[PDB]
Design a protein around this ligand. Structure first.
Ligand code: CLA
Ligand code: CLA
Ligand code: CLA
Ligand code: CLA
Ligand code: CLA
Ligand code: CLA
Ligand SMILES: CC1=C(C#C/C(C)=C/C=C/C(C)=C/C=C/C=C(C)/C=C/C=C(\C)C#CC2=C(C)C[C@@H](O)CC2(C)C)C(C)(C)C[C@H](O)C1
Ligand SMILES: CC1=C(C#C/C(C)=C/C=C/C(C)=C/C=C/C=C(C)/C=C/C=C(\C)C#CC2=C(C)C[C@@H](O)CC2(C)C)C(C)(C)C[C@H](O)C1
Ligand SMILES: CC1=C(C#C/C(C)=C/C=C/C(C)=C/C=C/C=C(C)/C=C/C=C(\C)C#CC2=C(C)C[C@@H](O)CC2(C)C)C(C)(C)C[C@H](O)C1
Ligand SMILES: CC1=C(C#C/C(C)=C/C=C/C(C)=C/C=C/C=C(C)/C=C/C=C(C)/C=C/C2=C(C)CCCC2(C)C)C(C)(C)C[C@H](O)C1
Ligand SMILES: CC1=C(C#C/C(C)=C/C=C/C(C)=C/C=C\C=C(C)\C=C\C=C(C)\C=C\C2=C(C)CCCC2(C)C)C(C)(C)C[C@H](O)C1
Ligand SMILES: CC1=CCCC(C)(C)[C@H]1/C=C/C(C)=C/C=C/C(C)=C/C=C/C=C(C)/C=C/C=C(C)/C=C/C1=C(C)CCCC1(C)C
Lengths: 104, 139, 219, 151, 162, 80, 34, 174
């Protein structure tokens, strides 16, 4: 949140050009936009009957219970999180492009 | 005659190929020229710039860069109105080219010959003859 | 320039003389080690901070001998000074295995206070603030008669008691290291090493290894 | 909108104004680092840089040095880090001798007196930061392992 | 270069003298300390497994450095680290190993600098010159007589040490 | 700097002067040859040593000769 | 070996301190204007 | 000027006296890192959720809704959440709170634009704030109660994590 959708601090993406990074709006919208389709369930062993977002959230909970121990190589945590983060980064990138550039 | 520092530079978006700290502490070269058009040329240090109609001015690090650009403007845009200067960090500006108003490939009166040797190249002195002697090998 | 504390020696250059607690005693010129203007203020704050902790520490050791709060004796046992810090740490999580958190809780609350004071030290050092060293404004019962900073007479008393406490608490800790008696018991035993009360070894035990081989090791 | 521009309005200088180079966030970091922070003497700049560098130096020597599996690993890690610091201080000293001529001014790093102050600060800070890292690692079992004490 | 106070200078004379006076004191102390057996576990040879191959000394048996020599070396390390810090970052009032180069050199002492009873630069030079001579004397006596330096210090001092 | 010499076999073709990238050479008047002109080297402090002048020269052995000498910033071609 | 302490004294000095000092002073000599 | 809360520290520049709940307490200067209007709305949103949570914990110990006991027999606070996630009671709440937060995002944008005051959704059905002098007290009281509720909620849930009985039961039998 270097700059939010407001004229607070004089932020400049570069030497002399101010540019409003819309970190609240883009981060929130990208998060929700990616999560709602991702909820789609699937009776696949990786998901376990949940969606990707719900399974990823469940994987954080099950590995946080064994807090010092990390998830193992065959643990579904590593696959679920990587796919979820890759989609989130892609929808954040596309969201930043759409909102900052098209402005509407 | 002296460089008018206020001449507008050709439009350019910047590059990493420009001059470095040695230009601001040892010497810089400047070139001016007149363009009849607002046209794109190639910078010696990088990409493309646009010379403005009227008088242009650039700053480069090497004399060869100013002359490579001069060769280019003359060959393509037929601009023979280019003057090359050397600038020292003391503010002293030294006119360089063309040194007496006439291009070097054209003869001019009042030019004194430097480096001219009265015999042919095969008539030089052997190194042994001038060993432990200050005498020059050019006869 | 001649110092009052040491008449022959040249007066410390950096020290103002208008500062509280100044008798001219800075032979090693620690005040001049950093050229920055705020550094002398940093030194003054440190002295008071070292003094204030020491003052509490001195009283605390004495009071711990005089009496203990209800129930403490049962858990810790008969450990007396630094040994109680070690015992508590053994029974706290992270440091050890147990159901106690006395040392960790003290550190958490003291740490929150110290982060705020740290910002104050930085601001005073760079000259942003007009606050003098140690002036945190804590005078709930009026004593300075309208200023928490206090009069020069009182601040002299604070600085000198703090210096005295630093020496005294150091003595008490060191005396517990060999006799294991604690402040009051050691005072009662003017001839000591004749009788030594056993003390569990400190968390830093390598330092107490050159007693027997190089030193006499009377204890 | 365009994010890349000539450096300090000069199209013919050998630099560009890119977000990594000249953003507000980048400007804030560079300006607040001890090397560039305003209001710092050259000695204090040396002290802050020295504390940082000496502190991290101890760790690689201790964990990966020849005596890593011995019970004297931390002492070896401190001595090797200190040895490196002594060599680095000599590198700073010789650089100061050749690079700067003697002048009255002492408030700037790029002066002979100022560089000497930076070296004095860096030496003390590196010894102090390496010493602090030594005390912390000696006493806390989490730091001795990679956090592996919890497993 | 050599205009920084190095070479044969009153500055070098004083600094070497200061080290020699300390060295005489240290040799007296080490002779007394070892004589009373106050160096812990001196006979033991340091193990290569614990302390690395640096410990190896390649003598006929054991092939490892003794604990005593290691302890004495560590004392010298302690003072040497102080020395490096003092040279690079000296105290404000302290004399400096290297001089500014625009410094005015102090006059050479000559055969005998003027006698000053109080602590003074004169007394420091007189004692420092004497101590440097003493270090040479003790080493040469140990070489020619064939005894250890520790014994020579004891014998010169009348066995007071031990 | 580099040392540049012009020998009296120069036919005054001006080719060395046109080929020089650093404006070291120029043409002066001379009665020796048919063209009435000879090459000259008044600005050898700017000579980078490229030897494009020698490449341009058509006399059987070069009338213009470059002798590489002490290096400077100008003759090393350093823009830094 | 007789005088067996000598290699462990001289090899670090010859191998580390001697080159470190000749490099330091050679660097000073080759980078001085006068 | 000095901070009123921390006397030794300088007054935080980003903060102002007009803002409700202002005591000068920003020792770490986090107001510089992010816009104050965003933080102000964030604080009130946390305050309102925390206030509801603390009241809920007390109410849940005092009484339960009809038939709730059959689904959850022994679970007291965090425990009822897991069984009611499968019952879909928590699922339904999540859906409707998320639905309100969608319009919350538009409100947050209006705040950042500067037209909208932080934390104002114009929900005053009973006209409590009509006088405009009672309004200042109400705005302050809301901020203060919410701050206490954040501390209270965390304090209560942690008490449950140790002694699993809830806040009122802990008070009765320690
Ligand atoms: C992954 C999610 C996603 C996708 C696919 C799109 C796609 C699109 N957006 Mg949207 N947008 C998103 C998230 C996304 N957006 C979010 C989160 C926000 C809010 C912050 C917005 C806000 C926004 C605005 C305000 C506007 C758009 C517009 C557009 C269109 C053209 C501009 C553009 O971004 O080019 C993207 C071009 C493409 C996607 C097509 C190219 C095809 C290649 C293969 C791209 C693939 C990229 C990547 C691999 C796909 C990942 C999918 C998934 C795995 C994550 C395009 C249909 C503009 C438009 O046209 O209006 C309707 C417009 O005005 N978007
Ligand atoms: C450096 C100071 C210091 C340290 C590290 C300790 C640490 C400890 N003490 Mg000791 N103690 C201290 C000072 C200190 N005390 C002082 C100043 C007193 C009173 C004169 C005591 C009296 C005391 C007793 C009687 C007992 C302990 C005990 C203990 C142990 C358990 C914690 C506890 O119950 O403390 C409780 C301590 C207190 C409640 C005293 C707090 C007095 C405060 C600090 C002074 C007033 C502060 C001031 C008014 C406002 C400060 C804030 C201001 C700066 C803004 C622990 C190892 C217990 C123990 O294990 O016995 C062996 C125990 O029974 N302490
Ligand atoms: C960190 C130091 C320390 C330690 C380890 C203890 C430990 C204990 N205290 Mg003590 N206590 C301390 C500091 C400490 N206290 C301080 C600083 C005070 C304030 C003066 C008290 C005041 C106090 C009182 C007044 C009483 C205890 C009691 C107890 C016991 C609790 C019995 C019980 O039913 O628990 C539950 C206890 C409570 C919920 C409150 C007490 C326990 C052994 C009690 C005891 O001896 O009963 C057997 C008791 O009556 N403590
Ligand atoms: C201040 C230092 C110091 C002290 C306290 C002593 C003390 C002593 N030395 Mg002397 N000595 C010293 C310096 C000192 N020495 C120096 C610098 C040298 C030259 C290397 C000698 C050379 C020396 C010899 C050759 C002998 C002594 C001997 C003795 C002891 C008995 C004779 C006597 O009274 O000495 C009077 C003083 C002197 C003889 C010299 C001064 C006596 C305890 C004798 C002894 O016991 O040897 C085993 C003996 O034979 N000393
Ligand atoms: C998420 C919370 C929750 C849950 C899980 C339940 C679950 C239940 N309620 Mg309760 N209820 C709730 C909230 C809840 N209620 C609320 C908010 C109200 C309004 C105050 C009621 C008012 C209510 C009444 C009036 C009755 C139930 C009844 C029932 C049971 C239905 C049995 C049947 O035949 O029909 C069921 C176990 C019935 C029952 O058996 O309870 C006596 C019934 O008649 N509910
Ligand atoms: C409104 C704030 C509030 C209130 C009134 C309480 C009140 C209580 N808490 Mg909760 N708590 C709070 C905030 C609060 N807590 C917060 C913000 C945290 C951090 C997450 C905790 C963490 C916490 C833990 C971990 C524990 C308590 C405990 C307690 C009780 C003993 C009091 C005590 O230890 O003080 C001691 C006060 C002093 C030493 C100051 C003198 C008491 C019922 C203890 C308890 O008995 O509950 C099981 C306990 O174990 N609380
Ligand atoms: C500031 C402020 C406030 C406050 C406050 C407070 C809590 C003030 C606390 C002040 C205290 C505790 C001062 C104590 C200093 C101790 C000294 C000088 C003793 C050192 C020991 C020596 C010399 C010794 C020794 C010994 C040796 C080594 C051997 C041992 O075996 C034994 C022996 C003991 C003989 C209040 C709230 C009032 C408000 C006010 O508006 C402002
Ligand atoms: C003895 C000793 C040391 C030492 C030392 C020093 C500095 C010894 C210096 C000895 C010198 C500089 C002797 C100069 C002799 C010149 C002469 C006699 C010619 C005169 C005409 C050190 C400080 C390393 C400690 C060590 O534990 C023992
Ligand atoms: C605004 C709006 C509307 C509305 C509305 C609403 C829903 C208003 C609701 C407001 C609420 C619910 C406020 C609740 C605050 C609770 C607090 C501060 C907690 C205190 C607990 C403590 C300190 C404790 C504790 C404990 C700790 C931590 C550990 C425990 O083990 C034990 C223990 C118990 C000791 C209406 C409809 C009225 C109209 C109006 O026109 C506009
Ligand atoms: C908690 C914990 C620990 C702990 C601990 C603590 C608290 C350790 C305490 C350490 C202290 C305070 C030592 C004091 C040293 C003071 C000395 C040597 C003399 C100073 C004054 C002088 C020289 C005066 C000089 C002079 C005088 C005479 C007057 C003239 C002028 C002047 C030159 C000023 C452990 C380590 C046990 C670990 C364990 O896990 C538990
Ligand atoms: C600054 C300052 C001070 C202070 C102070 C301090 C240190 C205050 C500390 C406040 C803290 C640390 C609150 C912590 C947590 C709040 C929580 C956990 C709410 C949790 C909800 C949960 C856990 C639900 C979780 C869950 C649910 C049901 C679903 C299942 C899973 C599960 C995880 C169990 C003072 C005291 C000096 C005063 C001074 O004037 C100002
Ligand atoms: C985290 C992270 C996340 C995002 C990306 C990222 C930014 C790249 C990355 C950062 C990574 C990096 C690079 C993090 C780097 C972190 C580093 C190197 C931190 C260094 C800290 C130094 C300390 C605490 C020194 C203390 C010395 C003291 C207290 C003095 C002690 C002494 C003195 C003199 C006084 C007397 C006593 C003694 C003990 C002698």
């Amino acid at each position: 949140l270097s700059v939010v959708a407001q004229s607070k601090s004089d932020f400049e993406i570069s030497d002399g050009t101010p540019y409003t990074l819309n970190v609240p709006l883009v981060g929130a919208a990208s998060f929700i936009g990616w999560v709602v389709p991702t909820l789609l369930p699937s009776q696949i062993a990786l998901y376990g009957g949940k969606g990707l977002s719900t399974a990823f959230f469940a994987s954080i909970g099950t590995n946080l219970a064994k807090f010092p121990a990390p998830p193992g190589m065959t643990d579904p945590f590593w696959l679920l999180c990587f796919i979820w983060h890759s989609g989130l980064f892609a929808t954040m990138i596309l969201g930043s492009i759409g909102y900052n550039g098209y402005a509407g | 005659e002296t460089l008018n520092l206020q001449i507008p530079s050709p439009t350019f978006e910047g590059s990493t190929g420009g001059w470095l700290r040695a230009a601001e502490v040892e010497e810089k070269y400047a070139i001016t020229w007149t363009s009849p058009k607002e046209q794109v040329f190639e910078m010696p240090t990088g990409g493309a710039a646009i010379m403005r109609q009227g008088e242009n001015l650039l700053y480069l690090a090497r004399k060869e860069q100013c002359l490579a650009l001069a060769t280019q403007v003359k060959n393509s845009f037929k601009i023979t109105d280019y003057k090359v200067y050397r600038i020292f960090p003391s503010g002293e500006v030294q006119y360089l080219h063309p040194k007496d108003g006439v291009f070097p490939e054209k003869v001019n009166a009042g030019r004194v010959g430097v480096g001219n040797v009265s015999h042919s190249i095969g008539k030089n002195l052997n190194p042994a003859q001038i060993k432990f002697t200050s005498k020059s090998f050019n006869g | 320039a001649k110092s009052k504390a040491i008449p022959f020696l040249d007066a410390p250059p950096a020290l103002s003389e208008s500062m509280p607690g100044y008798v001219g005693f800075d032979p090693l010129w620690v005040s001049s080690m950093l050229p920055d203007a705020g550094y002398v203020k940093f030194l003054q704050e440190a002295e008071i901070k070292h003094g204030r902790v020491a003052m509490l520490a001195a009283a605390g050791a004495i009071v711990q001998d005089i009496f203990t709060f209800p129930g403490v004796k049962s858990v810790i046992g008969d450990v007396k000074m630094t040994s109680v810090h070690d015992k508590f740490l053994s029974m706290e999580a992270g440091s050890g295995k147990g159901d106690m958190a006395a040392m960790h809780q003290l550190l958490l609350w003291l740490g929150l206070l110290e982060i705020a004071t740290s910002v104050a030290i930085i601001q005073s050092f760079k000259g942003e603030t007009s606050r003098g060293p140690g002036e945190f404004g804590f005078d709930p019962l009026n004593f300075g008669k309208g200023n928490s900073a206090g009069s020069d007479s009182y601040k002299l008393k604070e600085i000198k008691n703090g210096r005295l406490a630093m020496i005294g608490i150091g003595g008490m800790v060191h005396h517990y290291l060999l006799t294991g008696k604690g402040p009051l018991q050691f005072l009662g035993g003017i001839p000591n090493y004749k009788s030594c009360v056993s003390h569990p070894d400190s968390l830093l035990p390598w330092l107490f290894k050159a007693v027997g081989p190089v030193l006499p090791k009377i204890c | 909108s365009q994010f890349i521009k000539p450096y300090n309005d000069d199209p013919f200088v050998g630099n560009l104004a890119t977000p990594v180079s000249t953003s507000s966030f980048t400007k804030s970091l560079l300006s607040n680092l001890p090397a560039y922070r305003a209001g710092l003497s050259p000695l204090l700049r040396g002290v802050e840089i020295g504390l940082t560098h000496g502190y991290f130096l101890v760790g690689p020597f201790y964990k990966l040095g020849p005596l890593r599996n011995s019970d004297v690993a931390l002492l070896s890690g401190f001595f090797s880090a200190l040895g490196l610091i002594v060599i680095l201080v000599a590198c700073l000293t010789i650089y100061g001798v050749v690079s700067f001529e003697e002048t009255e001014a002492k408030d700037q790093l790029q002066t002979a007196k100022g560089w000497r102050q930076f070296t004095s600060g860096w030496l003390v800070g590196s010894v102090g930061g390496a010493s602090f890292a030594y005390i912390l690692i000696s006493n806390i079992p989490f730091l001795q392992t990679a956090g592996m004490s919890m497993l | 270069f050599g205009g920084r106070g190095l070479g044969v200078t009153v500055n070098a004379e004083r600094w070497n003298g200061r080290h020699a006076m300390f060295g005489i004191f240290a040799m007296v102390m080490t002779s007394y300390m070892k004589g009373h057996g106050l160096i812990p576990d001196a006979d033991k040879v340091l193990d290569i497994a614990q302390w690395g191959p640096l410990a190896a000394v390649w003598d006929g048996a054991g092939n490892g450095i003794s604990n005593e020599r290691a302890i004495i070396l560590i004392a010298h390390v302690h003072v040497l680290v102080v020395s490096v810090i003092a040279a690079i970052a000296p105290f404000g009032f302290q004399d400096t190993l290297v001089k500014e180069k625009g410094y005015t050199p102090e006059s050479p002492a000559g055969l005998i600098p003027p006698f000053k009873t109080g602590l003074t630069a004169e007394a420091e030079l007189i004692n420092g010159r004497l101590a440097m001579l003493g270090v040479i004397s003790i080493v040469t006596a140990s070489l020619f007589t064939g005894t250890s330096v520790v014994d020579t210090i004891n014998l010169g001092m009348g066995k007071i040490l031990y | 700097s580099h040392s540049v010499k012009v020998y009296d076999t120069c036919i005054g073709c001006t080719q060395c002067v046109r080929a020089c990238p650093c404006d070291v050479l120029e043409m002066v008047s001379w009665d020796g040859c048919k063209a009435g002109q000879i090459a000259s080297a008044p600005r050898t402090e700017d000579c980078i040593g490229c030897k494009r002048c020698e490449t341009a020269c058509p006399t059987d052995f070069l009338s213009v000769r470059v002798y590489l000498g002490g290096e400077t910033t100008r003759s090393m071609g350093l823009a830094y | 070996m007789t005088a067996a302490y000598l290699p462990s004294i001289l090899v670090p000095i010859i191998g580390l301190i001697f080159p470190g000092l000749v490099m330091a002073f050679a660097f000073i000599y080759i980078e001085q204007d006068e | 000027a000095m901070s009123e809360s921390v006397p030794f520290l300088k007054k935080p520049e980003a903060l102002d006296s007009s803002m409700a709940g202002y005591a000068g307490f920003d020792p770490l200067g986090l107001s510089s890192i992010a816009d104050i209007k965003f933080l102000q709305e964030s604080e009130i949103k946390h305050c309102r959720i925390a206030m509801l949570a603390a009241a809920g914990s007390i109410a849940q110990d005092i009484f339960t809704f009809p038939g709730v006991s059959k689904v959850v027999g022994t679970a007291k606070m965090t425990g009822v959440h897991d069984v009611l996630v499968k019952q879909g009671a928590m699922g339904q709440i999540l859906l409707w709170t998320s639905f309100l937060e969608v319009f919350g995002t538009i409100a947050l944008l209006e705040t950042l634009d500067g037209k909208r005051a932080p934390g104002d959704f114009k929900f005053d059905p009973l006209g409590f704030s009509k006088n405009a002098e009672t309004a200042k007290r109400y705005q302050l009281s809301e901020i203060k109660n919410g701050r206490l509720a954040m501390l209270a909620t965390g304090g209560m849930v942690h008490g449950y994590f140790i002694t699993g009985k809830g806040p009122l039961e802990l008070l009765t039998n320690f």
